[PDB]
Amino acid sequence: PNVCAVQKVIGTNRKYFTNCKQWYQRKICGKSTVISYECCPGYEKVPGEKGCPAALPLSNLYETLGVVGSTTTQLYTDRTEKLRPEMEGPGSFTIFAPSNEAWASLPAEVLDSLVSNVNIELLNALRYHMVGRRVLTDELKHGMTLTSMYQNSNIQIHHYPNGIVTVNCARLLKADHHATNGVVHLIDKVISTITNNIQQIIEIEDTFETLRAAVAASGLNTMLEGNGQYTLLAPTNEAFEKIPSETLNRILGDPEALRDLLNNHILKSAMCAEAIVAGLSVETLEGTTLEVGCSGDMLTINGKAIISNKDILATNGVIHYIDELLIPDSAKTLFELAAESDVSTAIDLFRQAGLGNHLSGSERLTLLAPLNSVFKDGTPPIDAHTRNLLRNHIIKDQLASKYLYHGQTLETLGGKKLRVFVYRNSLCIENSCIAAHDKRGRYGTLFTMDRVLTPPMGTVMDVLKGDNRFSMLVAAIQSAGLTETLNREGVYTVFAPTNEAFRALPPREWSRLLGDAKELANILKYHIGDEILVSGGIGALVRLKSLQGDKLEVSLKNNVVSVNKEPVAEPDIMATNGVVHVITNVLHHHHH
């Protein structure tokens, strides 16, 4: 009875006093916890009965400070010789009472303001912690302000979805201790008035002179002066200095890159550090996601403990000081955003082939970079041939793969025109298909691909004529009158049977070709799809209309293309007027 829980991280005095819950966080900021049991606010154990069945009497607000252990608050209240009669007297009051540890751990700046004029400033601080009406935590809505009893100065309230409540980012430790004339809330810090907006803090602090100048040049000072709830992850001078000067001046002197940079430090609502007890994904005003988390008493951004000062309060939100600059992809060159990524091998090869200048400056390009796993079994060598192929992985203009359309053509720096194939569940450029989301830089975009491109060199007939396995196919095509179809412009998919395929036909099948050139033509045309289906465009099952009219059933299973239950021996031989897939038996006519 009257049952409450204490969750202590081990090593500390960091405690979360709660209503007993049914699911408790195993770890708080990566540090495991022990759980304990206390009696709830205002109840005491009697020996021989379990729980805490006895309620304690209410007392006035001054006395309740003692009941919750806020004895320094009492001592200082008694010192003022003014406020204790008010706390014992008529009215309805809230006090956010700092804990003894809070008063004993004053930041040097609040100690400074008190010791200047001790009697008056202690009375003012104590009044700032109070409100002239009772307010329970049920009435503490996120983002509200309460008017304190010091000069009508606002107190800022946050009430996060995980139940943590903060008062000027001080954590509310023990809530809703009723008094005969109000309520006592025990808080974790001594709070002070909030007099500057975010822009004013930028303009005051010498650690933000570089940020200040960037904000001014971008024109963002208007927003940071305005009404709003923001978190600024404010980069210090030291953060900017860690960036090579040629990178930084490139970003700061370009209005689009400068604005994306600054926006990538701003979140759309105010977030006190004490809110964060596990990983949380947030989105910046630039659009990038950051992983906010924590390790002990250190806030982390993407796992890196780069927050050197937490919870600097402004009238329009919260500032946390950050030691590294959060450069978004949209401010980067292609080399900057790709060199340490899933395509870093491919990026290294562009560099070794003398093509790095395309990636390191302001050229408007799209880069087709295969994944590192493509090069698991080795890298091509740095020739003129590899150089030339790599130049044909560099596209003119900055593109977004999602806005590409079927039949679009892309011009390369090697002078080639590559074909875009848009299928239902994949996007391919020639034989190679997009394998991850774009990374959009300032001037160029990285497309991550699953394969090295193989640009076409000749027509279908050039392909078939160049390989000894298709001599019967080439002769049959001529005999069937199909040769010039397959050497002129088109979008064919040729399931090309080898010589062993034709010799495997039984006599009853072969003898249907004898004296019947139109039957040979009909058979060959059944092997020719009327649109280009590279293997990366094949899902569970796709119908492809042949030139004979009936449809082929094409599927991909265990990374092998099949057509009418015939596996492809060698896929994706690209041609200027189609794609060739090799098969080792002739296709059987199916069901329509």
Numbering used by the authors: 46 to 637
Article sentences:
The principal constituent of the protein deposits is one of the most abundant proteins in the extracellular matrix (ECM) of the human cornea, transforming growth factor-β–induced protein (TGFBIp). The function of corneal TGFBIp is elusive, but its ability to bind both integrins and ECM molecules indicates a role in cell adhesion. TGFBIp consists of an N-terminal CROPT domain followed by four fasciclin 1 (FAS1) domains (FAS1-1, FAS1-2, FAS1-3, and FAS1-4). The X-ray crystal structure of wildtype TGFBIp reveals an elongated banana-shaped molecule with the five domains arranged like pearls on a curved string.
Among the most frequent pathogenic mutations are R124H and R555W, both associated with granular corneal dystrophy (GCD) characterized by the early-onset formation of amorphous aggregates. A striking feature found in both the R124H and R555W structures and involving their mutated residues is a crystal packing interface between the FAS1-1 and FAS1-4 domains of different TGFBIp molecules, where residue 124 interacts with residue 555 in a second TGFBIp molecule (i.e., His124 and Arg555 in R124H, Arg124 and Trp555 in R555W). In the much more hydrophobic R555W interface, there are no water molecules close to Trp555. The interface is organized around the Trp555 side chain, and similarly to the R124H interface, the tryptophan indole ring is surrounded by a hydrophobic shell of side chains contributed by Phe547, Leu550, Leu558, Leu559, Leu120, Y121, Val163, and Leu167. A crucial interaction sealing the pocket around Trp555 is made by Arg124 from the second TGFBIp molecule, as its guanidinium group stacks with the tryptophan indole ring in a cation–π interaction. In addition, the Arg124 side chain further stabilizes the intermolecular interaction through hydrogen bonds with the main-chain carbonyl groups of Leu550 and Phe547. The FAS1-1:FAS1-4 interface in the R555W structure is significantly more hydrophobic than in the R124H structure, with a ΔiG p-value of 0.11 and 0.40, respectively. This R555W FAS1-1:FAS1-4 interface is also by far the most hydrophobic in all the four TGFBIp crystal structures determined to date and has a calculated ΔiG of −9 kcal/mol, which is also the most favorable value of all the intermolecular contacts present in these structures. The Arg124 and Arg555 residues in wildtype TGFBIp do not permit this intermolecular interface due to size and electrostatic repulsion between the two arginines.
